[model samples]
Target: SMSVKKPKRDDSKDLALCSMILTEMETHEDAWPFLLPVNLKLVPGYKKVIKKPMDFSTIREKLSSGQYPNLETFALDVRLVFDNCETFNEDDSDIGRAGHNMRKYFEKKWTDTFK
Candidate 1:
């Protein structure tokens, strides 16, 4: 543990919320692209456009490792994935629409869960 520490909070409660979010996201039909890292080979220029790529797999791994400090931090990574998706895919495209749907669903869950 470092001597210089910011406000240390027990994030176990927040962790449970993320588990629920991940479980539900997996069940979504539009979760296909988000389930894993975007394949650079399959979709060239993905890495170039998305400087900081994020995916469900990476988020899950970090959660498993207990690396996320809080729910807000966790949500940022989740949002980043969708952010990248929307930026890369056209608004009218299927993937872009899926990102929009996924973000909407995630936000709804976030509010209800915390409320």
Candidate 2:
């Protein structure tokens, strides 16, 4: 048996790509730190160091609200989230490693789907 044929909408294909990537990020095992914004109590330095905080939920909302006009912009937000973790956390720390791991997966998945 075969799955339903996928239809291509050239104009909004990027939107679909973001949707797929976001869901994967959500379900990823190490997605814990990236799921929500870093809180003040957990990381007071988060507020001071990270100029703009971005998280998985924020990206999901941005995608839902049509705030991300294209795939690159959507990626930019997600990239920032990963970068922010590096800025505040030690490289070998839990969240630090998760971000890097997720970034690798996210980028690889993105490239595979984009083309």
Candidate 3:
């Protein structure tokens, strides 16, 4: 008879980490460069890609779902937040900066949490 080994899971820890990332992003919004300094709204290019905004609560729920089994998977899903941004340019443009920053943020979080 073959015994199936169960994978280790610390869902509570992961949920805390997700919440940390969200808090970090929100705290740093003033320096994000993509939002207007005065009103904190997305610039034109960002607006083009961010057709729909996502609520952090929804993100939290998704992260809690088993579909995102780990931090790496969660990062992949988070990176898609700007999937519809057609005008995004990695090197130049605020929207591009936003995307890169978001990815970088998640990468760091994944590394710290999983590795």
Candidate 4:
């Protein structure tokens, strides 16, 4: 019998690469914060409550503002960040749990749209 190994997801690498790509693509700074929920909530003076349904106002605002030449491309990149975060972090903290759920939320939306 042959055994195969599954590839591991690299969150740090993904974060760095995504950051560079988004920067080169000129993604909005405000929307960029949504890429990492930990950083999103940790910034000094960030008092907004991140309740259920995940608000996602910054990303939505950026989407509606017409910054990206292709909205779905940027949206998928943003969702990929959440996917990486959810996989890398244990569900110990609020951010970790929220990221996990939010990733599922977006995944469902994307799947439903395609279906």
Candidate 5:
């Protein structure tokens, strides 16, 4: 398991982990969430692919379609938020805009690789 240095108490790691988990849950079970953060319908998924083969369908598709491959493990750790963050929206001012951006970005990235 990969490890990362802790950032803060209420870090977005939960969201990132939840995204990965949600992706994986839908992959195995393919359903909706029963809760806000964690869903109960998620099922176990494939083991992490450490070294992907040179030629795979998903990789070929990603290369051809300009997206991350299926076996990609680019899941964001807690540190990535701070590493790339330009500002924080604690007052919930950017929540709507940020939520839109997040949804658009995640959907564009994961639409094909998802189950």
Candidate 6:
């Protein structure tokens, strides 16, 4: 018989990464503070100047706007970020977690379309 090793899910690592990514997205100085309270100091890669701050802002605005035109798109963006971080996926692979989170978060806002 062969033994396989499974990747461990560290909640601390995911929370730290989420905090940092949210902080990086806040550099725009025009975002809601509580909505995305990302503290870069909490994350590992905060020092590097992320090149796509606007991308995050764009998605944030859509979610904050309370509109539906671009909600699916918005959910997709959040999924990408949440999935990329190991923190969000505890029971499954990051990719699987991403899909689950995307649906979960989106439904909270757009329950009708989410189904």
Each model's total of backbone clashes = 0, 0, 1, 0, 0, 2
> In candidate 1, residue 26 scores what lDDT?
79
* RMSD after Cα superposition, model 1: 3.6
List per-candidate RMSD values in Å.
3.6, 8.0, 5.8, 13.2, 17.6, 16.6
Residue 39 C-alpha lDDT in model 2 = 85
Once superposed on the true structure, which residue ranges of model 6 sit more than 4 Å away at CA? 1-35, 46-60, 65-69, 87-112
Task: Please give the range of 10 consecutive residues that has the lowest summed lDDT in model 4.
Answer: 46-55
Encode model 1's per-residue lDDT on 30-115: one tens digit a residue: 99989998888888888788899999989999988989887888899999999998889998988889999999999999899875
Clashes of 3: 1
Q: Which ten residues in a row have the lowest lDDT in candidate 1?
A: 8-17
Off by over 4 Å in 5: 1-72, 77-87
Local distance difference test, each candidate: 0.88, 0.86, 0.55, 0.48, 0.33, 0.44
Model 1 stretches astray by more than 4 angstroms: 1-12
Task: Give the per-residue lDDT of model 4 (tens digit) for 1-115.
Answer: 2587678544344333433444433343333325434454555433343222122444444455655455355566566556554554567866677666656655565454333
Residue 38, model 2: Cα distance from true site in angstroms: 1.3
Q: Please give the lDDT score for candidate 5.
A: 0.33
Tens-place lDDT per residue, model 2, 20-53, is 8899989999999989877867776777778999
State which candidate has the highest lDDT.
1
Candidate 4 — which residues are off by over 4 angstroms?
1-55, 80-89
lDDT per residue as tens, model 5, 1-115: 2687666455334334435644543343212211122212352221232122121223223334535322333333212222222232233445434434443454545555343
Instruction: List candidate 2 stretches off by more than 4 Å.
Output: 1-9
Error at 40, model 3, angstroms: 19
- Colliding pairs, model 4: none
